[PDB]
Every structure is written in C-alpha cells, then in structure tokens.
Design a protein around this ligand. Structure first.
Ligand SMILES: [Ca+2]
Ligand SMILES: [Ca+2]
Ligand SMILES: [Ca+2]
Lengths: 145, 23
C-alpha cells in the first residue's frame, strides 16, 4: 500500500506524457493523439469510454488524483512479472512473439519525447541481445529487469 | 482491464528509460 514521493513522481511523468498541455487533465483528444501516434485508431466513442474507466468524478477528463488511483491500484494488484508480460503483449501488435526493431524504435521515439536518435539506437542495440532485428519476450524481460 | 493496461504499459516504457539511464 505504501507509495513513495518518488513513485508518485514517476506516475506523474506518465500522466504528463498524455497531459501534453500541462493543464492537469487528460482529455479524449490528448489520449487519441498518443494512441494514434502508436498506430491505434479508436473512435471518439471508444476514447470517451476509455476516459470513463479512469474518470472517477464523471466530468469527462482524467485528473492526476484519478490517474494515480488507477496506476497505484494496477501496480498493487499485478505481480511484477505479469505487468511486464502484459506490456509485451501491448507492444507485440501482431501477436507473433516479437517486436521488430523498427516498431520498438517508433514506440520509444514517441514515448521518450526528448530522446535523440543516438540514444534510441543504443537502447535498441542493447535490447536486441541476439541481434536478429527483433525483440522477443525473453529480451523484453531483460530490458525491464 | 484493456484501458488500464495501455496506460500502465507506457509507464513501464518510461520505467525502462530510467533503468537504461542508470545502467
Ligand atoms: Ca491536458
Ligand atoms: Ca475527472
Ligand atoms: Ca532479438
């Protein structure tokens, strides 16, 4: 149940990735912007429903206390290994057991907003242990641990 | 579960960035 200042600050960094205008709320527009950048394309109705899963007070946006409630609960309720397994399935779009190096580079470039090309190159090179141009599940586990 | 997992996955990528910067 314990939540350190550092853990809260890390969850705030996740919040601000979506709240790109820094107004303290995540809107359907901001959510859609991130999801589309990663190759998803939800309808406006789907985006509203997604906001509604997190929006505890029903005003149509996610504020940080709502975001933190949801993220701390997910961390508490999920074993660290399942958290990583789930994330791998998120980024393995085809479901073929691999994330291509190009796909991972795109995810990192969009989610690490200040990263340079050289930085993402090092990360990819380190991630793809066997050098086959894919990141498999065992390699993804090595990344996250 | 799907919505929560998508938010959590982006936090986990940011956690990787922190871990990588430490290594
Ligand atoms: Ca905002
Ligand atoms: Ca709200
Ligand atoms: Ca590989």
């Amino acid at each position: 149940d314990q939540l350190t200042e550092e853990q809260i600050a890390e969850f705030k960094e996740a919040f601000s990735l979506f709240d790109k205008d820094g107004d303290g709320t995540i809107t359907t527009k901001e959510l859609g912007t991130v999801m589309r950048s990663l190759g998803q394309n939800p309808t406006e109705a789907e985006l509203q429903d997604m906001i509604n899963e997190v929006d505890a007070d029903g005003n149509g946006t996610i504020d940080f206390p709502e975001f933190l409630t949801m993220m701390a609960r997910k961390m508490k309720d999920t074993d660290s290994e399942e958290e990583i397994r789930e994330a791998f399935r998120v980024f393995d779009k085809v479901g073929n057991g691999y994330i291509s190096a190009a796909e991972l580079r795109h995810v990192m470039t969009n989610l690490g907003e200040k990263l340079t090309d050289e930085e993402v190159d090092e990360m990819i090179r380190e991630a793809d242990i066997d050098g086959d141009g894919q990141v498999n599940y065992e390699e993804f586990v090595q990344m996250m641990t | 579960e799907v919505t929560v997992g998508k938010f959590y996955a982006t936090f986990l990528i940011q956690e990787y960035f922190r871990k990588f910067k430490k290594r």
